[PDB]
Design an enzyme around this catalytic site. Structure first.
Site, PDB file in Angstrom:
ATOM      1  N   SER A   5     -17.702  38.089-119.189  1.00  0.00           N
ATOM      2  CA  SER A   5     -18.967  38.185-119.844  1.00  0.00           C
ATOM      3  C   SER A   5     -18.607  40.261-120.220  1.00  0.00           C
ATOM      4  CB  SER A   5     -19.795  39.424-118.287  1.00  0.00           C
ATOM      5  OG  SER A   5     -20.663  38.415-118.185  1.00  0.00           O
ATOM      6  N   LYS A  65     -18.951  40.780-123.826  1.00  0.00           N
ATOM      7  CA  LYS A  65     -20.190  41.001-124.223  1.00  0.00           C
ATOM      8  C   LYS A  65     -19.832  42.382-124.998  1.00  0.00           C
ATOM      9  CE  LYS A  65     -22.196  38.269-121.435  1.00  0.00           C
ATOM     10  NZ  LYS A  65     -23.238  38.311-119.640  1.00  0.00           N
ATOM     11  N   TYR A  70     -20.080  31.506-127.976  1.00  0.00           N
ATOM     12  CA  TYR A  70     -20.239  32.283-126.486  1.00  0.00           C
ATOM     13  C   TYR A  70     -19.059  31.827-125.657  1.00  0.00           C
ATOM     14  CZ  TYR A  70     -21.733  34.832-122.555  1.00  0.00           C
ATOM     15  OH  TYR A  70     -21.790  35.163-121.286  1.00  0.00           O
ATOM     16  N   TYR A 118     -27.056  45.108-113.861  1.00  0.00           N
ATOM     17  CA  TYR A 118     -28.044  45.134-114.021  1.00  0.00           C
ATOM     18  C   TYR A 118     -28.935  45.903-113.542  1.00  0.00           C
ATOM     19  CZ  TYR A 118     -24.729  40.972-115.516  1.00  0.00           C
ATOM     20  OH  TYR A 118     -23.699  40.273-116.084  1.00  0.00           O
ATOM     21  N   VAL A 147     -16.649  37.092-114.743  1.00  0.00           N
ATOM     22  CA  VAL A 147     -16.578  36.031-113.762  1.00  0.00           C
ATOM     23  C   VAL A 147     -14.817  35.711-113.584  1.00  0.00           C
ATOM     24  CG1 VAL A 147     -18.867  35.855-112.974  1.00  0.00           C
ATOM     25  CG2 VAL A 147     -17.567  34.519-114.997  1.00  0.00           C
TER      26      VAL A 147
END
Lengths: 415, 415
Positions: free
Chosen positions: B64, B67, B191, B243, B261
């Site tokens: 992630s 991103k 991705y 988040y 992760v």
């Protein structure tokens, strides 16, 4: 000469002043009938300058824009633990959802929404504080940051109380969850009076400036709030000030702010400026239409944004000179981690055991490598305005490791 | 001597290294069986220094944390309008809710969540770009900011593809709403490969540093990204990186960051530092347990926070001298609004028509009032590292108003 910023502000007022979309808060006559053809703005700097234009000297009730200041007073009066147990740090819409209280062990989401503001007012002076004390304390914190005694518009107050069923709903639910200990009526009256505190665009700018500086009043230089408290306040302003529109607002405007239904918008950008704006008509979500648009303009035109890399950095090192046997390293500016880190680089680039700089912003750190052995280093702090605990410890440790190299170190520190 | 920061980092690694709570991403063997007893951290500064400790040179898939970089590449390749029509700026949990697409004219909430990341990858080079081009472009942007050619761990890739039903669900729903034009399989594969890009803690630190500087690579000084793009990226990192825990994270840590992760955590604090952290085990919400705790420690210990008033301000004015008839005003540092504003104050405090300073941070602006009439002013910019368009225009206008006072003005500007 004539400072150009006040001129930029006049332009903006004339520009955005061309139109006046939306309408005034219709829930009460005092705000419903207020003159809509009013528009002012102010920009207070850290040093103490106050630029403005339009109706920037016209008083209006601060309303919601009062929430960060009472939040600051509560954190100061009760400490973080006591406040964080009653008030969360999660952004959300003003619409109330009970599941949000049952969530995170009974506490409203944040200090920017009404439920949170009620809990904050409840916490104002102490558990045994009286109604009059908490109201005075709210007026006091706001006056202290404005730099003048503020008044409560009792006319707006009474007008609000006649239609405070919603806030009463919130207060009772908070009582049910143990977030409020006093009566719903008492806490709502306190909060309503708090919102009726009168301020001008200039005051908001000054009050915003105190927060932008980390708690230091720009006009006198006295520390009004602890830096951690001012930091928490601007933090919540950013994540929750604009409710569910906060993300988009952070990105596109980047200025922590809070609007009030009387037409005032408060802005606070750390290290740069305190913003006050006034314009009665609200948009579809209750924010001052021009106030919010004026913040967006300042952001874009002055390229001001919370994500700016506007830091002292290597500029902390004014210069480095090697006369012959000794080295003279002069520091300057507001030294915290960033500047102190740079100083450590300077002390390390010496041997006790250009273009790249400017391209980034290393100041005179490069003059360290450029500068017979080295038996003594002189750290002059005369040009340094102030240094936080972190900077002090880093530089203290830096000096300690110099001596450890059998290098003489003298710290010329006038004040 | 020895720089103390790397030492602070070693302490921290040893401290937090004492325990190892949580567990490694169990959804795939490559991550499920990875060695958990690993822990590294890096701090890259604007000037180009790289401090580190522990397993900071051990590669792991970026996941992630990739991103924000692909987001930067998309904004660069397609421009804001094209990207904002497919990707929102609203924070939210990773859990997918269809109503969120029907909301704000069909577009995932932000680039930090998987649905948004898929849309971003879709936008990577252009509407007619091939799969191979978009993957290369993702590897390219990441390599350019790391300062070295990065590799894709195809083993982790294939392992991920065997269990990509969820991302496939997201991609198909996005296709249904017209957010994706190519096939679900194609965009998900791109991705997934993007997330399999290998990086070390040091790389993340360097990559984070590029973002912290506004798009300038700290090791070479070359502008890798436009400042507005880097600004948008850190903005979304802050509002959505963590988040629904973003609000609390902004307040208590104040460092824009994103975890992956595989155990990597990326941090980017404008104007101060680039952060890279590595520690396999994830907490209950999928973030690197120690990685996140290490960011929290650095924040508290170094008193680093996005809300810091760490700005050049009045320090932009190195000094002001009045030899007799002429005045010599020297500038320095990274000049943007804050510094330029201070300069305007200096030019205005002259008559062409101490303690307070230090208490705030006005630098040598006060030397303006302190400084026969004044027929010529000399603006020396030799010590100024760089100035943004805003600063240039403000100072340009300042010089214009001086002459308007019939004052001679000479701008000594070597480079």
């Amino acid at each position: 000469m004539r400072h150009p910023i006040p001129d930029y502000l006049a332009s903006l007022v004339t520009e955005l002043g061309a139109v006046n979309p939306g309408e005034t808060a219709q829930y009460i006559p005092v705000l419903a009938e207020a003159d809509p053809d009013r528009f002012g703005i102010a920009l207070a700097t850290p040093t103490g300058r106050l630029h403005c234009a339009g109706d920037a000297d016209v008083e209006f009730t601060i309303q919601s824009a009062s929430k960060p200041f009472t939040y600051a007073a509560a954190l100061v009066d009760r400490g973080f633990a006591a406040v964080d147990r009653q008030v969360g740090l999660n952004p959300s819409g003003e619409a109330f959802n009970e599941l949000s209280l049952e969530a995170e062990s009974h506490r409203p989401d944040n200090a920017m929404i009404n439920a949170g503001a009620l809990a904050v007012h409840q916490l104002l002076v102490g558990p045994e504080a009286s109604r009059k004390e908490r109201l005075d304390r709210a007026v006091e914190i706001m006056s202290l940051l404005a730099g003048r005694r503020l008044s409560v518009d009792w006319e707006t107050y009474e007008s609000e109380m006649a239609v405070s069923d919603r806030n009463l709903s919130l207060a009772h639910m908070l009582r049910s969850y143990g977030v409020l200990q006093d009566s719903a009526e008492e806490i709502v009256a306190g909060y309503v009076a708090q919102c009726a505190v009168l301020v001008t665009v200039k005051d908001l700018a000054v009050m915003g400036a105190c927060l932008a500086t980390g708690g230091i009043h720009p006009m006198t230089g006295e520390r009004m709030l602890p830096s951690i408290v001012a930091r928490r306040v601007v933090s919540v302003m950013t994540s929750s000030g604009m409710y569910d529109a906060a993300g988009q607002w952070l990105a596109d405007v980047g200025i922590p702010a809070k609007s009030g239904v009387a037409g005032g918008v408060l802005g606070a950008l750390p290290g740069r400026v305190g913003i006050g704006v006034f314009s009665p008509r609200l948009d579809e979500v209750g924010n001052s239409a021009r106030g919010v648009l004026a913040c967006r303009r300042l952001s874009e035109d002055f390229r001001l944004h919370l994500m700016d890399g506007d830091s002292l950095g290597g500029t902390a090192v004014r210069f480095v000179e090697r006369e012959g046997d000794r080295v003279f390293l002069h520091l300057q500016g507001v030294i915290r981690f960033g500047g102190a880190e740079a100083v450590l680089d300077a002390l390390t680039d010496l041997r006790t055991g250009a273009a790249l700089s400017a391209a980034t912003g290393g100041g005179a750190v490069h003059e360290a490598a450029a500068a017979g052995p080295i038996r003594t280093v002189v750290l002059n702090l005369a040009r340094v305005d102030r240094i936080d605990d972190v900077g002090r410890r880093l530089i203290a440790e830096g000096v300690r490791r110099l001596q450890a190299d059998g290098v003489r170190v003298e710290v010329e520190d006038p004040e």
